[PDB]
Enzyme design. Structure first.
Site, mmCIF file in Angstrom:
data_model
loop_
_atom_site.group_PDB
_atom_site.id
_atom_site.type_symbol
_atom_site.label_atom_id
_atom_site.label_comp_id
_atom_site.label_asym_id
_atom_site.label_seq_id
_atom_site.Cartn_x
_atom_site.Cartn_y
_atom_site.Cartn_z
ATOM 1 N N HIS A 121 -59.190 69.226 105.060
ATOM 2 C CA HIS A 121 -58.074 68.118 106.267
ATOM 3 C C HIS A 121 -59.583 66.597 106.432
ATOM 4 O O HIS A 121 -60.180 67.035 106.048
ATOM 5 C CB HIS A 121 -57.660 68.721 107.500
ATOM 6 C CG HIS A 121 -56.392 68.344 108.137
ATOM 7 N ND1 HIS A 121 -57.170 66.908 108.915
ATOM 8 C CD2 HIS A 121 -55.245 68.160 108.363
ATOM 9 C CE1 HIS A 121 -56.430 66.567 109.421
ATOM 10 N NE2 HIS A 121 -55.314 67.242 109.416
ATOM 11 N N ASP A 198 -64.251 74.806 110.662
ATOM 12 C CA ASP A 198 -62.497 73.762 111.213
ATOM 13 C C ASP A 198 -61.735 74.654 110.941
ATOM 14 O O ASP A 198 -61.575 75.363 110.528
ATOM 15 C CB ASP A 198 -62.136 72.713 109.613
ATOM 16 C CG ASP A 198 -60.444 72.431 109.979
ATOM 17 O OD1 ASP A 198 -59.628 72.796 111.279
ATOM 18 O OD2 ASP A 198 -60.310 71.098 109.286
ATOM 19 N N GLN A 201 -55.952 75.913 111.444
ATOM 20 C CA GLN A 201 -55.083 76.653 111.110
ATOM 21 C C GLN A 201 -55.310 78.339 110.386
ATOM 22 O O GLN A 201 -54.644 78.521 111.116
ATOM 23 C CB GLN A 201 -55.129 76.061 109.251
ATOM 24 C CG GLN A 201 -54.123 76.311 109.182
ATOM 25 C CD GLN A 201 -51.806 77.214 109.517
ATOM 26 O OE1 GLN A 201 -51.720 77.441 109.308
ATOM 27 N NE2 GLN A 201 -52.196 75.956 109.730
ATOM 28 N N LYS A 224 -51.404 73.407 118.101
ATOM 29 C CA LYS A 224 -51.318 74.491 117.082
ATOM 30 C C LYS A 224 -50.935 75.721 117.213
ATOM 31 O O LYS A 224 -50.181 76.895 116.298
ATOM 32 C CB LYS A 224 -51.937 74.569 116.019
ATOM 33 C CG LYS A 224 -52.657 73.910 115.176
ATOM 34 C CD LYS A 224 -53.380 72.876 114.134
ATOM 35 C CE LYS A 224 -52.551 74.096 113.293
ATOM 36 N NZ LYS A 224 -52.609 73.443 111.506
ATOM 37 N N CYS A 361 -52.262 64.981 104.681
ATOM 38 C CA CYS A 361 -54.023 64.542 105.818
ATOM 39 C C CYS A 361 -54.661 65.267 104.333
ATOM 40 O O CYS A 361 -56.179 65.773 104.989
ATOM 41 C CB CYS A 361 -54.261 65.171 106.588
ATOM 42 S SG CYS A 361 -53.027 63.515 108.558
HETATM 43 C C1 LIG Z 1 -56.864 73.103 108.998
HETATM 44 C C2 LIG Z 1 -56.294 71.371 109.425
HETATM 45 N N1 LIG Z 1 -57.719 70.963 110.311
HETATM 46 C C3 LIG Z 1 -57.632 69.963 111.102
HETATM 47 C C4 LIG Z 1 -56.640 69.635 111.521
HETATM 48 C C5 LIG Z 1 -56.328 68.650 113.092
HETATM 49 O O1 LIG Z 1 -55.639 68.694 113.923
HETATM 50 P P1 LIG Z 1 -55.737 68.131 114.947
HETATM 51 O O2 LIG Z 1 -55.264 67.031 114.559
HETATM 52 O O3 LIG Z 1 -54.915 68.737 116.581
HETATM 53 O O4 LIG Z 1 -56.678 67.714 115.803
HETATM 54 C C6 LIG Z 1 -55.514 70.061 110.905
HETATM 55 C C7 LIG Z 1 -53.816 69.243 111.893
HETATM 56 N N2 LIG Z 1 -53.078 70.309 111.961
HETATM 57 C C8 LIG Z 1 -55.059 70.998 110.180
HETATM 58 O O5 LIG Z 1 -54.060 72.331 110.143
#
Ligand SMILES: Cc1ncc(COP(=O)(O)O)c(CN)c1O
Ligand SMILES: Cc1ncc(COP(=O)(O)O)c(CN)c1O
Lengths: 412, 412
Positions: A121, A198, A201, A224, A361
């Site tokens: 991401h 990270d 998910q 999430k 993204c």
């Molecule tokens: C795998 C992954 N990494 C990071 C993020 C970014 O998280 P956030 O927008 O809540 O800061 C996301 C966005 N859903 C995501 O799914």
């Protein structure tokens, strides 16, 4: 695990969109909230809202107790050793940025390497780009297998004695891949690197054990996992957090403040500047209580069933491409032959079905996949096989519609 | 402006603490919320929660419309020229840190000066300490008058041709002083400096006109103005924000993402990385609607009445010291002779009255006042003169109690 009893607690699921029952298949973008979480926020604002870090009055004491108890709930939830390792942040993005600012930019020299993957991401890409640019270090990418997974030998090949940080996703929000986080942690440590997971998910859908993963840092987002928006968590090993400087400065995180110099508080408050996200953190604790009462293993089994069912039913569709491996989390990213995914999402919403279209993204992953955009349906604990049936039926209807619109003005 | 009708909308006010009706006089720490705001959060999570920045499905469109409409509400509320100048942040502290990171650390060389005041909150001190340390610049303090106000000639004396930033509070959360922000803005501009206004204590209680103040930056917190916790605003002149680099990196704030380089979005989204504070921002918009329907001038007049009444009744108390000027915002910071403020707050909470004791995150101001700690009662739109009567009666009772406890074991 009774899915009807679970759906009964989410008020937002019980409405119609465009005259069709809502079919929400976009939980990777964000998840919906049970009544427990919303009513937790309500009880906070109705009964004991006050600024935290107590000592003076009753409502302030109750607010502080709720906030720090939510911190302890998070510690138990991901099996961290100490509350000092649990930092409340704005979300996964802010947590990863904090690691990149206060660890990476302080521990990177020219010749050092930060190693990520092509499936990351953007939240786990851009901070490292900026950090290696600021330090003169080098950014490297672990290649992907043909099925969208990561081989451990490619990890051993990419990570070298100059690698200081390996930043990797626990679960890809596009491919559904669950990465071998524990083995990668040991590989990174063997080369003298830390590992940054990270887990945006992974956290909502599967159990997290930071002591068994041996991750040096772990990031997650509340929105999430049935929790309020605007709050997330940075976990970091206490020994690393003790030597990192704060990413933000101000009240609450200071001990002594002089005219020109100041001293910081102990962990975790060293990294929480200003009035914190009190209500959101307490609601995230409520969401953790909710998920734990249901059971993360139960949720993961339900999503395994949903993913297997969805993959089979997608394979029953002609002219549809699915990306990623067979063994996967509860999501399917796909494309219809000769139909742009944005049109797919539009038609599906006309049928009441909520999916996402675009790059998700993850532009480097899209270019690795040799596509500009994809469509994605993601599942959570309130989704059913009937909703997947509706999804595949709408995809077949979409195929037929864009087919016969094409043949009709071909004749015209 | 009917204060009973206003109190009727705040459910948290209608409870007892320690067998006494709650008397909440700690709104400078944080404010309470009307039903409009709480029910706005409820309606969001119950009806149209989704990730924002639309294009795909209905709930996503409604969420995006709510979020960006809250941005427009904020723009109207502080009279900014453009929504591009309104950045949603975690709070005042994060906004000031963003200015210190992306403006100060990029525009400061050795010999440059950052000028602040002795009355500043820690949120408006520590970021500048760190920025001048990182750049090799110099931090300077504007002295205070004997009554806790700032003279314009002291500003002209402290600000020089080497001053690049003047960071000042709009309203002091301790002294109650309203600083001459507009005149200071022109003084700073005459020397080639920008001005950074900490408006956390001004925004909830008085009208803000950033075009009339001509502030270069303005920071505010939602939790102090009847809004949800965890959200705030950074306003900055569009021309300055266009040349500042982002403070955070990740999704939503990018345009093109390559393997090693990326381009940013246009304002304001350049400065909003990751999934934003959707529900909190929409609730802050609801709080703005609430305050505007009541009228900020009405609230300011009510607080002027409360402050005058409180100052007179405090002057009716023997052995009590009040800090700050006569012309002030709606708060009183004080001390009882030979009673530590923490004991004062404890006894008052035993009487059901909620005040704050300590440094109020302004240690240099405490040392300027030649005290280690103070007690503080702060007012908002739901407070009454009867509550101030209860406060002064409890302070007299506290004086008598600590007097006769002292005389009793003197005899013993
Ligand atoms: C795998 C992954 N990494 C990071 C993020 C970014 O998280 P956030 O927008 O809540 O800061 C996301 C966005 N859903 C995501 O799914
Ligand atoms: C005048 C002043 N400045 C800044 C702050 C910090 O704001 P926040 O904690 O919401 O970030 C406060 C705290 N109430 C304040 O009153």
């Amino acid at each position: 695990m009774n899915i009807t009893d679970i759906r009964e607690q989410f008020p937002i699921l019980h409405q119609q969109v465009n005259g069709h029952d809502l079919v929400y298949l976009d939980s990777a973008a964000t998840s919906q909230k049970p009544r427990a979480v919303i009513e937790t926020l309500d009880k906070y604002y109705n009964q004991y809202n006050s600024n935290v870090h107590r000592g003076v009055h009753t409502l302030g004491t109750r607010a502080t107790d709720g906030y720090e108890g939510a911190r302890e709930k998070v510690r138990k939830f991901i099996n961290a050793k100490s509350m000092a390792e649990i930092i409340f942040t704005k979300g996964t993005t802010t947590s990863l940025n904090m690691v990149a600012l206060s660890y990476a930019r302080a521990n990177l020299k020219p010749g050092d390497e930060v190693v990520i993957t092509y499936m990351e991401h953007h939240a786990n890409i851009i901070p490292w780009q900026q950090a290696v640019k600021a330090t003169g270090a080098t950014l490297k990418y672990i290649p992907l297998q043909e099925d969208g997974t990561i081989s451990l030998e490619d990890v051993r090949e990419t990570v070298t004695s100059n690698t200081k940080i390996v930043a990797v996703s626990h679960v890809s929000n596009v491919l559904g891949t669950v990465n071998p986080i524990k083995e990668m942690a040991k590989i990174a440590h063997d080369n003298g690197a830390v590992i940054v997971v990270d887990g945006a998910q992974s956290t909502p859908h599967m159990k997290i054990d930071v002591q068994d993963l041996d991750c040096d840092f772990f990031a997650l987002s509340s929105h999430k996992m049935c929790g309020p928006t605007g709050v997330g968590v940075l976990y970091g090993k206490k020994a690393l957090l003790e030597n990192m400087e704060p990413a933000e400065f101000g009240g609450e995180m200071i001990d002594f403040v002089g005219l020109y110099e100041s001293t910081w508080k102990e962990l975790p408050w060293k990294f929480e500047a200003g009035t914190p996200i009190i209500a959101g953190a307490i609601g995230l604790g409520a969401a953790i209580d909710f998920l734990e009462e249901i059971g993360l293993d139960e949720i993961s089994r339900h999503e395994h069933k949903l993913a297997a069912y969805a993959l089979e039913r997608f394979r029953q569709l002609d002219g549809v491409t699915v990306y990623g491996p067979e063994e996967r989390a509860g999501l399917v990213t796909f494309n219809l032959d000769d139909v742009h995914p944005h049109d797919v999402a539009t038609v599906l919403d006309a049928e009441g079905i909520a999916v996402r279209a675009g790059h998700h993204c993850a532009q480097p992953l899209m270019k690795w996949l040799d596509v500009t955009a994809t469509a994605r349906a993601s599942f959570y604990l309130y989704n059913t096989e009937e909703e997947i049936d509706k999804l595949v039926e709408a995809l077949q209807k979409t195929k037929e519609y864009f087919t016969n619109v094409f043949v009709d003005l071909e004749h015209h």
